[PDB]
Ligand binder design. Structure first.
Ligand SMILES: Cc1cc2nc3c(=O)[nH]c(=O)nc-3n(C[C@H](O)[C@H](O)[C@H](O)COP(=O)(O)O)c2cc1C
Ligand SMILES: Cc1cc2nc3c(=O)[nH]c(=O)nc-3n(C[C@H](O)[C@H](O)[C@H](O)COP(=O)(O)O)c2cc1C
Ligand SMILES: Cc1cc2nc3c(=O)[nH]c(=O)nc-3n(C[C@H](O)[C@H](O)[C@H](O)COP(=O)(O)O)c2cc1C
Ligand SMILES: Cc1cc2nc3c(=O)[nH]c(=O)nc-3n(C[C@H](O)[C@H](O)[C@H](O)COP(=O)(O)O)c2cc1C
Ligand SMILES: C[C@H](C(=O)O)c1ccccc1
Ligand SMILES: C[C@H](C(=O)O)c1ccccc1
Ligand SMILES: C[C@H](C(=O)O)c1ccccc1
Ligand SMILES: C[C@H](C(=O)O)c1ccccc1
Ligand SMILES: C[C@H](C(=O)O)c1ccccc1
Ligand SMILES: C[C@H](C(=O)O)c1ccccc1
Ligand SMILES: C[C@H](C(=O)O)c1ccccc1
Ligand SMILES: C[C@H](C(=O)O)c1ccccc1
Lengths: 327, 327, 327, 327
């Protein structure tokens, strides 16, 4: 919700609010994530049984309360002193998976100890052995999926951060402590874990197909929130094509700009299994810590149920069968 | 007309003007109703006989003076002290059907006693028997059609109203005194009345077809003025597809954003039998009571005749055969 | 040119500037005339012989210096005291046809006496005999074509004029001194003159075809400058379709929003034989009388030649064979 | 980069900043060059080997460091006292071809003596012999290609310059010291040089094909930065069609609005061999002379490499095989 964004702008130092809000380049891809969702209209169905509307899904072996997970966002102590623990606690209590980052400001084992349904996001290290160590650590700690970020051979050029000369406060560190990943890297991860491997940052149809062929359990259709290639298509504009191409071969998630339950409904109707949400979770953390994130997740939960029922869907499956029109 | 909107803003308390003007969510569907009409252009015909231009139609057994009816709008005493009686009187005198609401602030029997061509809008009650009682009451009072609202399994989230903490003044009540409706509910209504049943809030083509199959006498292609699902397609964007699918099997009405006789002409040219008009009627009621609504209906009548003749149509039938271009 | 518009706003009384600038309704069709031209892009050709670029055309038996004529605009004494005589003189000297109006503020015989290539615009009178008298007068005076306006069964609702309570100054009159025209009216005119009859205000393809069948020598594809049906498609959006349908059976002119030589080039490339120009001619008349109109026509002549040659066209015929892309 | 534009506005006299920034007419084609690029989105590829990303290309017999050359811009002493020598030096040092203009404010032999990879832009003179002299001079001086400008049968109408009454300062001259070029002119140039002839200002597909047939070694798909025909399509909107039509028969360059490495990537993905960059180079020259241009070229080099790798391309060839989506 947009209320939370203003609250976060008030509390955070400007340069940190910019690290959070910004995109790469001219921010064309950042803006397009929103434009893309705004142009999607749902064709709701009427007069269906709504006696037992449920927003639950099963994904990567487990039930989730909503078709949504908290996206990986590095260094969450930048936003609140409890950082990742505040968010992970709120996510647990909401029944939403939480993605622990490779660049988390609290150790992955500490965040996993919170409980809930933790996933682990991997950045490939120069050193196949350390990469595979991180994976093994995550698995030993009870993470349920490996979200391999594949869109960051190196970081995008964030002009806000360069303009600010933004740097990590010395009170924030990479508590778990890089090279471009390839398909060979994916295979090394797949061969070393029994957890589902989910490739995050896929936009081309042939890469979605190859992800299935590679043994991925999922993909996240994503332009990294407009922070990587400036001019990369929004994931929501590729999603329907990608869902058709994989034809049920893996879960297909999407992110970028999801700001309401209606947006979740749009993504579902375009064929997404679930969405990730990034910036809004951080606005809520900045504004009110754990209880802020809890309130955000409850509002999203309400909005998703509302939208589903208004659209005649008693389940997320039904929402996936909704048609859309581009406006 | 837009003159009336400003007049109403001046006279009404802010929170009531917001209950009236607002949509759900981000108001995306509210804005899109207008955008959709603005992008439609008519291809007028020339050099046709206009000696006897008539705006009359026959609908649900009766003549109407224009291809238009007053939409159901709950609690019209919110806008003027004479509420529904002022509007119903003006509608009668203009030869326009008036839709009496389930949530009317004057009793349905009182409004029907005004005369004219009253229709009755139904909200389904938890309790098939009370629902069917309302229907029987309406029929006994001389209502000519049952407008079953099928897009409100529960109310949309109106953020204006939540922000205002808007509530009914204790001087406005539901003078006729809820559960999600299904297709079984439609059948129960159809089996209990000889009046045409008109399903209001249809947007999917397959729901329009099923409405015909269900024995509806009409549908209203509608996103509830942008007040229900935020992100629901505008009815005007579905209308041509829907008209083709039903292929004369029931009357096909449309609403949402109709603000002029030219807009009526656009809807007709897209295949609508008639339109509903909501907010403008309430602006006129707020501004000048019965005579306000009369002046609005006379202006609309003038604008419809003007537009028709400019477009070479001596009858509404001819207007339906006009072609359009999207701009 | 836009310089002239400001100059005219300065000199004219507000209500007269509004009679000139305004459209009907919400001015949707007025704005769309401009939008339509702005979205058209020309694909220029290179490396062609331009040794003898000519902007001349033959139309309705006679040479014209440019593919352009002055549109019919009633009551030109509203804008300058010399009214129609100032404009007709400038047009003559530029080699541009001038359309004398039925509602001219100087008599048709006086304006024709100026010389040049006068056409005569007809409004159909209640009274076939008086209509045919006007036609005969025009023909006896040496007018070369009858421009039958077919888009005014009655006048559009000009809200600017209603708001101003605009009325003709008693010093402006209809110096030549109404009913809806039909196809029978066209035939009566065609049977009573040997001059080419040009139907002005055609937008539907089937009306363009029927115009040919009816023996018209031309049509003007036009929404009457956005002053008749509000929501009528711009002529420029129908032109290519219309040109294809008539397949050389009559001349096909266009008007609405032409504001430069580049706009003339766009219209030509879409298949127009020539354009009409209305409002700009009146801005020039208001600003500087006869010499104002002369300067406007010389600027347009320069701009047309410039655009043609830049686009590799040594003749208007070649310009008609240019391709376009919609942006 | 946009930083440089403001810096240049500060330092340059207004009328010179306008000679540089302006387009012809209403500047519709100038704006459309930017719009066109902004609507192009790239579909990046992931997980490819990026161990040796190279931005180098071979063109017209020689290696270039980037798929980019400095566009021909007349009279560069207008912007800085070192004019063309400052730019040519920076280009040399960056490994970017520099296009020497026929209307250069330093002699072509002086600029060629700088070294690097100089090309020579030709304007056709009234006098085939002088034209061919210029060509021979360029060839004798070591220029590697002849960029024949074919979109200037005469200059466009630059309203900024007419409004300013802009004229060359007497301290700027055409140091190398006109008629419309035709296909016969192209042949005369082709027959008189062994250098590749590159036709600059092609927009029609059939002109691109005829350029190949004529023995051109390249074309530049271009609307001359919006300075020639106002309303000419942007080159970027024709590029994909043109690349398909020539089917490898010559190099296909593009210009107009390229303002970042991401823009270069878009052009490549649409099929361009390379781009030209005009205005930005002049902003950098105005702001900081030779070192300004060097800094611009290093920033562009960084941005091109960044974008390529983010998009999974280890070479420009790979970038050409990227797909795009129009937004
Ligand atoms: C401050 C910030 C940090 C991020 N850090 C990471 C990261 O460490 N790993 C990752 O895969 N994605 C990262 N992302 C991208 C998000 O996972 C997600 O793709 C993007 O934020 C989704 O868009 P949304 O923020 O619009 O909801 C980050 C995003 C932001 C805004
Ligand atoms: C204040 C308000 C109250 C409404 N109440 C009802 C209602 O009780 N029943 C119903 O079916 N629709 C209701 N509607 C929706 C209208 O019938 C209609 O679909 C919508 O207003 C049409 O759009 P328009 O207002 O843009 O003309 C209401 C609309 C407004 C603005
Ligand atoms: C003040 C005014 C008066 C007009 N009078 C007439 C008229 O008497 N007869 C006619 O056929 N068209 C008339 N028109 C329409 C023009 O002939 C022409 O279709 C329209 O002005 C073309 O558009 P433009 O003004 O954008 O160039 C008039 C237009 C204006 C602005
Ligand atoms: C001030 C100026 C002068 C120019 N002079 C020439 C010229 O002498 N020869 C030529 O072929 N193009 C000329 N051009 C056009 C450029 O070569 C190029 O096509 C255009 O600038 C590319 O667009 P960009 O400026 O947006 O990068 C000129 C452009 C500008 C802005
Ligand atoms: C992936 C993520 C991002 O900001 O996109 C990131 C944040 C900080 C440092 C490295 C990467
Ligand atoms: C005009 C409207 C819009 O884009 O607001 C629209 C919605 C759905 C499909 C087409 C157009
Ligand atoms: C259907 C209608 C509405 O506002 O959409 C309504 C108004 C007041 C209370 C309930 C429903
Ligand atoms: C450009 C114009 C508009 O959208 O204003 C248009 C009207 C009808 C069809 C296409 C375009
Ligand atoms: C046709 C023309 C017009 O304004 O469109 C007109 C002007 C004055 C009076 C009648 C008609
Ligand atoms: C993007 C550009 C525009 O509309 O400015 C365009 C010109 C011609 C064709 C398509 C797009
Ligand atoms: C081609 C170029 C231009 O400005 O487009 C030019 C600049 C000055 C003088 C002549 C031509
Ligand atoms: C909505 C978005 C945009 O134009 O910003 C888009 C990007 C690529 C393709 C279609 C739409």
């Amino acid at each position: 919700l947009a209320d939370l964004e203003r609250a976060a702008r008030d509390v955070l130092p400007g340069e940190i609010f910019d690290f959070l809000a910004g995109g790469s380049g001219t921010e064309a891809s950042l803006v397009a994530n929103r434009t893309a969702l705004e142009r999607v209209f749902v064709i709701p169905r009427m007069l269906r049984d709504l006696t037992d509307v449920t927003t639950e899904i099963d994904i990567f072996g487990r039930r989730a309360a909503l078709p949504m997970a908290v996206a990986p966002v590095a260094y969450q102590r930048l936003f609140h002193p409890e950082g990742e623990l505040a968010v992970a606690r709120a996510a647990r209590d909401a029944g939403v998976p939480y993605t622990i980052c490779t660049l988390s400001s609290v150790s992955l084992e500490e965040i996993a100890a919170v409980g809930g349904r933790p996933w682990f996001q991997l950045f490939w290290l120069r050193d196949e052995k350390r990469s595979l160590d991180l994976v093994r650590r995550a698995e030993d700690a009870g993470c349920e999926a490996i979200v391999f970020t594949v869109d960051v051979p190196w970081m995008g050029r964030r002009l806000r951060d360069m303009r600010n000369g933004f740097a990590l406060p010395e009170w924030v560190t990479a508590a778990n402590f890089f090279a471009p990943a390839t398909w060979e890297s994916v295979e090394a991860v797949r061969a070393h874990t029994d957890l589902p491997v989910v490739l995050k940052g896929i936009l081309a149809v042939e890469d979605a197909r190859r992800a299935v062929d590679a043994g991925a359990g999922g993909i996240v259709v994503s332009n990294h929130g407009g922070r990587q290639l400036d001019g990369a298509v929004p994931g929501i504009e590729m999603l329907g094509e990608i869902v058709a191409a994989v034809s049920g071969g893996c879960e297909v998630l999407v992110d970028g700009g999801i700001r309401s339950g209606g947006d979740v409904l749009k993504a579902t109707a375009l064929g997404a299994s679930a969405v990730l949400v990034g910036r809004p979770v951080m606005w809520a953390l900045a504004a009110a810590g754990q209880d802020g994130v809890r309130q955000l997740l409850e509002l999203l939960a309400e909005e998703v149920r509302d939208a589903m029922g208004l659209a005649g869907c008693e389940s997320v499956g039904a929402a996936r069968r909704l048609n859309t029109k581009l406006g």
